[PDB]
RNA sequence: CCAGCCGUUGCGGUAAUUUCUAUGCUUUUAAAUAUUAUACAUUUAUUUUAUAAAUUUGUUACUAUAUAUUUUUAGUCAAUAAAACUAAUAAUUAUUUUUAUUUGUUUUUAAACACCGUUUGGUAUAUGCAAAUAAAAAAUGACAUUAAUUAUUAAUUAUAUUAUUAUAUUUAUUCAUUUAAGUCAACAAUAUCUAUUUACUGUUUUUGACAACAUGAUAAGGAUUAUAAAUGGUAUUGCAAAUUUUAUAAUCAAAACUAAUUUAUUAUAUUAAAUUAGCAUGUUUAGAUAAAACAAUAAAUUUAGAAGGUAUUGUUGCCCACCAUUCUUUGUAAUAAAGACAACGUGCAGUAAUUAAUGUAUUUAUAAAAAUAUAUUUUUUUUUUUU
């Protein structure tokens, strides 16, 4: 047992350091943004 | 061990609260020999099928001098109860009879018979150490 | 190494309290075996409190009609028979189908030592408050 | 390291130490032992 | 406390007298105490700081046709990135000292002629010989800075030297093109570099670099020099050996408890 | 940490918890694991393990006769996905295209004046819109082959007797291919270190290749002889 | 160089340039006694100044692709053929049953799998894709730890068809594979995971 | 750890190069032993005498409306406002204070705060007496006969908001098992030129691995070196390689708990074959308390970088007084002083150390000491150059 107290958080290594940079925050919906570049376009 | 009860304790390490695997407990400690259910009373810590013959220490193979107690894994038969012959059975402290026979006990193994852990524990064998941890307990008060 | 401390001898004359207690224990061995195998069988021989869970579907159904019809009618003398034991009805009820598989599926039956409360158990306190002098896995009563 | 001794035919510490081969070196065949074939003995056995 | 007795090891034919002298101790409170380092034949020259000694015609031989240093050493780090070997900082690191061998030399001029004020006419064959005199002193390390500096400073210039300025120089003040002419001239005459501009470049370049800070030129006298710089260039302790590490001793089984190796991906990643 | 060579140089040490290479401090780079300039380092350039993996079955089914089974074993088996499926002709009723489709391909092909492109055949390039679409890009699309959804129980009848029909190959037989042959010995060597065995079981095939090569040579010049004008032997 | 501000891509550049120059350049270049560095030290000399898109691999007989998905380090592990189907009738089925019944027609895991295609713009009416277990074989598939495997596995497979759409899906994280791994069996923890025993203190 | 040793640090802890022995061995040859005599500084030194000095003097400040919780951490208690000016500071280093003068105790509360003390009573600040650190001295203790010293300061001792990045965070808890001894050496039978060798006999002197002491040696345990493949340690955990000098203790079938270092299965369905667990139903309810950040999903109530030790592998470190034997010794003050020394009991006074310490003064007392009053740092630091 530890019988020591709980470490903070921060010294805790990052949760989720496996979890590849490209997944946080997830960039969803890639397929709109060529649809919202035109309609933008158009009224400008 | 820490209190050696036998030669095997200068040996054999408690190893902590070890868990063992199922029925394959180091030493045979048939604590529960005797936990009477009436319901199971021929099948409990007896033969699976009452078609099996009898084991081999109800039996005698060839020409002894004598057994000084006849082995606790032998069953009682009536020709046990009747005849009254002094029948021992090893047990702690030294060795334990059956002096009183009944045909309560015909067909059971002496497993069955004897009670391994006597109710009444010896304030003598256990040092003041261990003795005063049964007061705690209550088996032993004060 | 906390070195291995012996235990002192057995005491003396400890063995005559041995032979002794082993003994007149063993005798003692009958008599609870006496009683308790009584116990079991006049057990067996006594009614139940109906197995079954008269909340659930089938069971609420009014005694008239449901299942109750049936168990009135087809097998009633049966059902006596076998003395309402929560083992047997749920076998012999399974054997007559003609409520189809809606004995385990559906039909939901009290726990165990509610199922072995003898006929006429009115009062809750009853099914915990079974004699001790008996030792027989809480098949007695 | 005691009165036990190590068995030299199982042992990596002693069969992979530089007094014989490492586990790593092209492992070839050290020394063909023509024995049997160039000063034979002839067969005097004990039982007749 | 019953204090335990260990009989010294003779030597063998498989111990070497020098081995257990060193591999060995009786005394067994110095025993489990900690690691000893000690160099031995090569690496022992760069922590000693000395080539190999003009011993016999073989050492001679092996110290003429050297070459360009500065060149060897930027190729034996650069090949670092071929498939045989990685790239290594203690190669690296050896490129560092063979461009700034001379550095200590050079932090010296930058110092003579861009911190001494009316060093006198540096044109004068007097002053650029004690320059190149003491300039042999600072590189070959026969005089530390500080003493070279202030060899320079108070050289033997000129008879009444205070006056003569007085007239040219009026806040003492004077200017250094006259001077860093001079300066840069010396690595000219003294063979310090191979390359020609690197004398020129290295005391231009550690200028202009210092031509920023906040009172550019002056130096607190504690801190003019090498002294004990200016003109410059929670699990990690029970898991200091898991991340990717280079084992300048590899860890044994016995060393380390349960740690497998350290080219071991643990947690993989799906590589196509 | 260790050279950036091909990893199968690497032994996992032992005792010394690092890195050694089977090769005596030589290090292969690369380009010796590959054919010259292959992409990505590869046998082929054409496909992945996996690629290369299923891409073999559905090539190997293509071949597969009631012949190709018998006698060899789990090897003997087809493509355990090609086959189930072919197994479903319960689903296998080819839907054919629903009317709302060949609909909305008739409005576009016809009315708006419009070709309708398959998305293998778009011209998803911004660039290289004259690249072209990939050879096959007309491949029938029907519903027994592909996709492969098949039948359950068949499924476990299939993959239990692949377990149990392993052992069952007869190589001894009187072909002619590169599994013919009227013996066939199988050595197991066996070493505690790969790189061990890998290059002892190198050794023993120019071993075995030599004394294999003159040995059946001996018999084909005695075969030769056997037979021809004034050669007699099988008289 | 000595004040050390180069990174690992260019002592490839360098180092390509020094393997170039002949011996016959050096004492060409030693002469000047600078000049060979120059060369050795182009490409950073000036840089002190100052998305992959792979060919695609289709199978030219049967127009189908393949690729490779893995999620809890490798006990899921699924690849994805893919194929156009002409008819604008095909669909995605996974071990010989339609996803719905393997991922027994619950949303957020079938749902996973569409991303790929829509994330590149594709309609999947026209694709058919059939997902293998190829990972420790599970009688259900109902855990997103295992729909990534297969979202995973679809990503990689259109791209092996489709060169450009590498480009949307990778800005979307879909091709990227996770290094999560849960912690192997233990007999030190209780559970085996990651609670370890009980201790009291005297 | 006793005998003993001793010039002297220190030795003796059942492997002493330190006692005792025997023997040898060493010496530079009038022997050892015990007692005496045998040379401060002066250029800078903190505890008790100075008297080469300009002093003493100083009348200003602040109080009425009701109506009714301030001050403290905290209960006591309880009208509430206030006391400011200027002396000078002008003539030689001198000439010998030594019984003289001098160093923060101060009438008046019909005046307050302050302070000790409670229902409040006090007392509340240089008119007497009162030399006293601020060179003048010779190893600590000590009344000037005791103990052999003492004192001392720079190594070492992890959290005090500085300009790529998160602790607040559930899921758990009644757990035990061991038996009834036995090592003192080797011996082809078939198919190879024949051995009865078939049935190869020669009478007996030791005490470590043990039931006992007997050197080594690898573990458990998280706390500040990965962004393009790693979260478990050396100081050590029973059986291991030089210390022996009572002694067989080893698994075999059928076998008895006292043990800190342990997931046990909680109400649709429940014992099939080597023998395997019947009393504990009571609101998944005391106090204690257990373990995660890893292929999953919690990313912030917040971080390097200044600091001390009487200890000296260091806070489970030492120390300190009263409280007993003693012994010694006196200048004999409740209940002699001093020094020695190891018990028990009482705290826990000191090392910034649980309200910082030291000093001095007053008072208080189980005892280290505490309160008030002044200096003070051998206490750690917090830092406006006219708004």
Same mark, same amino acid.
């Given at each position: ?44 | ?142 | ?141 | ?48 | ?21 060193? $591999?060995?101790?009786?005394? #067994? ?5 900690? =690691? @000893?380092?000690?160099?031995? %034949?090569? *690496?022992? +020259? ?107 400073? $108070?050289?033997?210039?000129? #008879? ?5 300025? =007085? @007239?040219?120089?009026?806040? %003492?003040? *004077?200017? +250094? ?96 | ?235 | ?186 007999p030190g923890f209780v559970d085996g995971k990651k609670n370890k025993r009980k201790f009291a203190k005297r």
């Amino acid at each position: 047992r530890r019988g020591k107290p709980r470490p903070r958080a921060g010294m805790f290594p990052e949760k989720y350091r496996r979890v590849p940079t490209l997944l946080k925050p997830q960039q969803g919906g890639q397929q709109y943004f060529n649809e919202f570049l035109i309609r933008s376009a158009n009224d400008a | 061990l820490k209190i050696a009860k036998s030669t095997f304790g200068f040996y054999l390490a408690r190893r902590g609260q070890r868990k063992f695997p199922f029925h394959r407990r180091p030493h045979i400690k048939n604590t529960q020999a005797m936990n009477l259910n009436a319901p199971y009373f021929w099948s409990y810590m007896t033969a699976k099928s009452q078609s099996f013959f009898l084991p081999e220490e109800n039996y005698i193979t060839g020409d002894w001098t004598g057994k000084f107690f006849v082995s606790k894994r032998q069953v009682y038969t009536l020709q046990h109860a009747t005849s009254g012959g002094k029948v021992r059975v090893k047990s702690f402290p030294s060795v334990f009879e059956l002096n009183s026979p009944s045909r309560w006990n015909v067909g059971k193994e002496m497993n069955t018979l004897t009670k391994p852990r006597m109710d009444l524990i010896d304030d003598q064998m256990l040092t003041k150490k261990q003795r005063l941890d049964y007061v705690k307990a209550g088996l032993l008060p004060k | 190494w906390a070195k291995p401390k012996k235990r002192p001898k057995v005491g003396p004359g400890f063995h005559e309290k041995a032979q002794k207690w082993r003994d007149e224990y063993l005798l003692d061995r009958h008599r609870v075996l006496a009683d308790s195998l009584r116990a079991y069988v006049d057990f067996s021989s006594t009614k139940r409190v109906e197995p079954w869970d008269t909340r659930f579907a089938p069971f609420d159904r009014v005694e008239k009609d449901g299942v109750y019809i049936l168990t009135r009618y087809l097998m009633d003398d049966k059902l006596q028979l076998c003395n309402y034991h929560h083992r047997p009805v749920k076998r012999m009820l399974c054997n007559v189908g003609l409520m189809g598989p809606q004995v385990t599926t559906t039909a939901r039956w009290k726990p165990y030592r509610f199922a072995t409360n003898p006929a006429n158990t009115t009062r809750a306190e009853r099914t915990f408050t079974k004699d001790k002098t008996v030792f027989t896995g809480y098949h007695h009563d | 390291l005691g009165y036990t001794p190590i068995n030299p035919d199982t042992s990596p510490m002693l069969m992979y130490s530089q007094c014989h081969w490492h586990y790593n070196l092209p492992q070839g065949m050290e020394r063909p032992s023509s024995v049997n074939r160039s000063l034979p003995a002839p067969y005097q056995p004990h039982h007749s | 406390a019953k204090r335990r007795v260990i009989v010294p090891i003779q030597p063998t034919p498989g111990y070497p007298a020098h081995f257990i002298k060193t $591999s060995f101790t009786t005394d #067994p409170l110095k025993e489990k105490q900690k =690691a @000893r380092f000690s160099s031995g %034949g090569d *690496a022992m +020259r760069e922590v000693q700081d000395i080539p190999k000694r003009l011993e016999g015609q073989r050492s001679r031989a092996e110290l003429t046709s050297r070459g360009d240093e500065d060149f060897a050493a930027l190729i034996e780090f650069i090949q670092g990135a071929s498939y045989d070997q990685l790239i290594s900082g203690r190669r690296f690191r050896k490129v560092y000292e063979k461009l700034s061998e001379n550095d200590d030399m050079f932090v010296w001029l930058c110092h003579t002629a861009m911190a001494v004020l009316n060093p006198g006419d540096m044109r004068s064959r007097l002053i650029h010989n004690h320059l190149k005199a003491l300039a042999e002193a600072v590189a070959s390390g026969e005089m530390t800075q500080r003493t070279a500096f202030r060899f320079f400073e $108070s050289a033997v210039r000129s #008879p009444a030297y205070r006056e003569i300025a =007085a @007239r040219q120089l009026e806040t %003492g003040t *004077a200017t +250094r093109l006259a001077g860093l002419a001079a300066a840069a001239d010396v690595m000219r005459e003294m063979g310090l570099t191979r390359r020609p501009m690197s004398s020129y470049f290295e005391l231009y370049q550690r200028i202009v670099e210092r031509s920023e800070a906040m009172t550019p030129w002056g130096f607190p006298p504690l801190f003019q020099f090498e002294e004990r710089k200016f003109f410059s260039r929670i699990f990690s302790p029970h898991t200091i050996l898991q991340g990717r590490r280079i084992f300048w001793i590899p860890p044994t089984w016995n060393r380390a408890g349960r740690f497998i190796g350290p080219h071991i991906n643990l947690y993989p990643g799906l590589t196509p | 940490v260790r050279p950036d060579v091909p990893e199968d140089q690497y032994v996992d040490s032992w005792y010394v918890c690092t890195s050694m290479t089977h090769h005596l401090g030589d290090f292969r780079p690369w380009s010796a694991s590959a054919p010259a300039n292959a992409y990505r380092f590869r046998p082929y350039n054409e496909f992945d393990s996996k690629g290369r993996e299923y891409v073999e079955h559905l090539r190997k089914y293509s071949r597969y006769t009631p012949q190709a089974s018998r006698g060899k074993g789990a090897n003997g088996f087809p493509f355990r996905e090609a086959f189930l499926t072919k197994m479903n002709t319960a689903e296998t009723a080819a839907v054919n295209p629903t009317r709302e489709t060949v609909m909305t391909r008739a409005v576009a092909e016809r009315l708006h004046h419009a070709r309708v492109l398959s998305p293998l055949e778009v011209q998803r390039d911004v660039g290289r819109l004259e690249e072209p679409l990939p050879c096959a890009g007309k491949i029938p699309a029907e519903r027994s082959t592909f996709p492969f959804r098949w039948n359950t129980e068949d499924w476990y009848e299939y993959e239990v007797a692949k377990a149990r029909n392993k052992r069952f190959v007869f190589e001894n037989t009187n072909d002619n291919g590169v599994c013919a042959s009227e013996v066939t010995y199988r050595i197991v060597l066996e070493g505690f270190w790969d790189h061990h065995v890998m290059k002892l079981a190198d050794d023993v095939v120019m071993f075995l290749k030599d004394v294999g090569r003159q040995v059946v040579d001996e018999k084909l010049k005695s075969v030769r002889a056997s037979l021809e004008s004034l050669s007699s032997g099988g008289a | 160089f000595s004040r050390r501000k180069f990174n690992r891509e260019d002592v490839r550049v360098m180092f390509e340039n020094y393997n170039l120059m002949s011996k016959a350049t050096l004492e060409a270049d030693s002469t000047d006694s600078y000049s060979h560095f120059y060369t050795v030290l182009h490409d950073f000399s000036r840089k002190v100044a100052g998305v992959r898109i792979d060919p695609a691999e289709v199978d030219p007989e049967t127009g189908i692709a393949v690729g490779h998905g893995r999620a809890d380090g490798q006990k899921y592990m699924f690849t994805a053929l893919i194929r156009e189907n002409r008819d604008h009738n095909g669909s995605v089925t996974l071990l010989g049953k339609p996803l719905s019944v393997a991922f027994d027609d619950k949303s957020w895991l079938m749902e996973m799998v569409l991303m790929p295609f829509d994330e590149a713009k594709l309609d999947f009416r026209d694709f058919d894709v059939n997902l293998i277990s190829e990972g420790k074989a599970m009688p259900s598939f109902a855990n997103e730890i295992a729909a990534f495997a297969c979202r995973m596995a679809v990503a990689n497979a259109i791209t092996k068809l489709l060169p450009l759409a590498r480009i949307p899906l990778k800005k979307a994280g879909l091709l990227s594979v996770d290094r999560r791994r849960e912690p192997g069996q233990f007999p030190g923890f209780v559970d085996g995971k990651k609670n370890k025993r009980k201790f009291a203190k005297r």
